[PDB]
Amino acid sequence: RVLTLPGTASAPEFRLIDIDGLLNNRATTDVRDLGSGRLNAWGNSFPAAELPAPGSLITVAGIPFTWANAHARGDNIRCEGQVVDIPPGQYDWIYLLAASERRSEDTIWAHYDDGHADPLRVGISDFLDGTPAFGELSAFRTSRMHYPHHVQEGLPTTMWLTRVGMPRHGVARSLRLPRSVAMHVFALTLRTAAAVRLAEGA
Amino acid sequence: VELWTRDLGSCLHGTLATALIRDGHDPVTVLGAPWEFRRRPGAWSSEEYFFFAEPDSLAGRLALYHPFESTWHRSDGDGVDDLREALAAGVLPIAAVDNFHLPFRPAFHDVHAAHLLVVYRITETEVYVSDAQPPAFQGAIPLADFLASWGSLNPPDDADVFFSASPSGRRWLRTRMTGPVPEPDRHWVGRVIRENVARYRQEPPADTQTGLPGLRRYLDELCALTPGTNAASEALSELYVISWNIQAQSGLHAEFLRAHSVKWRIPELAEAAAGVDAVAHGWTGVRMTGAHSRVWQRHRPAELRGHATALVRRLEAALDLLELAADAVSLE
Ligand SMILES: N[C@@H](CCCC[NH3+])C(=O)O
């Protein structure tokens, strides 16, 4: 048997997390910083010219993000189990812009104000002309890749939008990123919980 | 001649897949059916395509369940005569080359790395090559460039502590499917899964670390070494090399399970596929943590030990899921 009923969802709110103080790695370079790339162990990096302007507000698949205000020693978070404070509240989804040195999967911990913590599964696909193994959406696909001594034509660098749910009906206070040098986080936006009910008909 | 590779894979599976596709064989079936872990101390070489194969041939081991086998050859000339004869015979030669001398590779005149590609046509001025590793290329190449690559000395390179110091040696690989292929029905997939699991669980030989017990002992030995020391450097170089194509096989095996899961609509096969892919992703934590300690001196023994036991646990979870899958596909 089949029963489908129309619903209505509220207007949730997007909280764009300032990660500028956690930046610890350089994965993007310009033609004059080619030797500073540390996206992978071979010294590769994203092309800056094909990525957003530092500090700009962008939208990937409708989801808003702030591009990191990079310093010369960091333009993203290479994941080392950092704890990230978030505005306390009731949430639905975590959205990350990320890439990994080869595909990997790991855990984001979510910490709630009554001491409960939840281990949340996250997968991030490869930066190297990747394909989304976890059902990620594509955030960026460059034309070129940067190497320590040249700009490589016809080699896409890939970044992903990945989605992590927070099932618990409770107030979240912080998150822990995975402990894996392979994983790179470039932006982090959280989405609030919103109310849904049956709509007009039925 | 069709380009074929996967993001977890190297030129080893990729060149063999091209050869397999040309004879009418599905590379996911032939190369994705077997799934194992083995390590022989002293066996590895600094090549992108190293895989421990004894007592079988390189292709025979990578295609455990098919009559596919391979032979290595060394051409003794200064030219490409032995390759013209092989093509004339209908063979597709797989050439051992140095990326340093291939104009279409990013490593060209930057980095020495031992590599494989498919040769598919030889004129008197140009060699036609096919190479699916990103950035994929397929077409003609100046014959002098090919000969420089095919004959390179691959001297030790400070920018490739993994695939340098292995001379190309003008050697090449012949492959052949030497008889009827098995019908890939549900019983066969059942037996393939059960044999992979039984091999993983069994007690290793004295001379070879194999399966789940071998992987445990291997990872324990790795974590015991002192980071920064010479023993740790050679150990981490071996780790990154031998685990590329082992990780490759895990990702290929999961695809083999996904494909048959869709074919017969057996969710036990997709659930097991997810377990096997988790082992593939577990290798990333171990490999990359070792890779950055070896190359950039990022010494993190706690992370390396943490990814290691996570890998073992994922392997233990996979094996259990694979057994439920084999039960759902067939009665034993
Ligand atoms: N791309 C290879 C490196 C090979 C050596 C440079 N062409 C890897 O990801 O390990």
Domains, chain A, ordered by start: 17-195 (2.60.120)
B166 & B292 share domain:
no
For residues A137 and B51, give the distance between their C-alpha atoms in angstroms, rounded to a whole number: 34
Q: Which residues 140-169 in chain B show a CB within 8 A of chain A?
A: 159
In a shared domain, residues B171 and B253: no
Q: Are residues B224 and B98 in the same domain?
A: no
- Whether residue B257 lies inside any domain: the answer is yes
Determined by X-ray
A182/B285 CB distance under 8 A = yes
Q: Which residues contact A20 (CB under 8 A, 6 or more apart)?
A: A68, A69
Round to whole Å and give the CA distance between B273 and B256: 8
Rg over alpha carbons for chain A, rounded to the nearest Å, is: 18
- Write out the E strands in A10-114: 14-16, 28-29, 46-47, 57-60, 63-66, 77-80, 83-89, 91-100, 104-112
- Domain range for B234 is 186-329
Stated resolution in angstroms: 2.7
A172 C-alpha to center of ligand 1: Å?
41
Determine the straight-line distance between the first and last CA of chain B, rounded to whole angstroms. 40
Tell whether B238 and B285 lie within a shared domain.
yes
State in Å: Cα B110 to ligand 1 middle.
12
Both tokens assigned to A109: 């911990």
Residue with tokens 């002293």: B42
- Which residues does A contribute to its contact with B (CB < 8 Å)? 38, 41, 100-106, 123, 125-126, 128-131, 133, 145, 147-150, 152, 154-155, 179-182
- Enumerate residues 6+ apart whose C-beta is below 8 A from A117: A109, A110, A111
Tally of domains in chain B = 2
Q: Give strand pairing partners of B94.
A: B118, B173
Q: Is residue B44 part of a domain?
A: no
Judge if B222 and B318 occupy the same domain: yes
Is residue B59 domain-resident? no
Residue that has been written with the tokens 């994965």 in this structure: A27
DSSP-derived pairing of the beta strands A196-198 and B38-39: unpaired
B249 C-alpha vs ligand 1 centroid, how far in Å? 17
Please check whether residues B139 and B233 belong to one and the same domain: no
Asked whether the beta carbons of A48 and A30 are under 8 A apart, the reply is: yes
In this structure, the number of other CB atoms found within 10 A of the CB of residue B180 comes to 8
Q: Are residues B230 and B271 in the same domain?
A: yes
Task: Tell me how far apart the alpha carbons of residues B97 and B45 are, in angstroms, rounded to a whole number.
Answer: 15
Cβ of A150 within 8 Å of Cβ of B110? The answer is yes
Q: Tokens for A141?
A: 């696909």
Same-domain status, B129 and B94: yes
Instruction: From residue B242, give the alpha-carbon distance in Å to each of A179, B42, B51, B163.
Output: 24, 11, 7, 11
Domain check: are B170 and B200 in the same one? Answer: no
Q: What dihedral do alpha carbons B4, B10, B15, B17 form, nearest 10°? A: -50
Same domain for B294 and B155?
Answer: no
Picking from A38, A130, A180, the nearest residue to B7 by CB comes out as A130
In a domain, B2, yes or no: no
- Indicate the burial class of B254 (C-beta count within 10 angstroms; 0-12, 13-18, 19 or more): buried
B277 domain residue, yes or no: yes
B200-235 in b/e form (b: 16+ CB < 10 A) is: beeebeeeebbbbebbbebbeebbebebeeeebbeb
Vertex B161 angle, CA B156 and B162, to 5°: 110
DSSP 8-state class, residue A32:
T
CA dist., res. A126 & res. A102, Å (int): 5
Q: Which of B177, B209, B239 is the last residue of a domain?
A: B177
Q: B16 vs chain A: nearest CA distance in angstroms? A: 21
φ/ψ of residue B217, rounded to 5: -65, -40
Verify that B263 and B209 share a domain, yes or no: yes
Query: Which residues line ligand 1 at a C-beta cut-off of 6 Å?
Result: B 48, 99, 107, 111, 113, 160, 163
Pairwise CA distance, residues B295 & B324, whole Å: 41
Q: Encoding tokens for residue B78?
A: 């200064």
Same domain as B136, residue B18: yes
Quote the CA–CA distance of A154 and A143 in Å, as a whole number: 6
d(CA B318, CA B37): 14
The verdict on residue B42 lying in a domain is: no
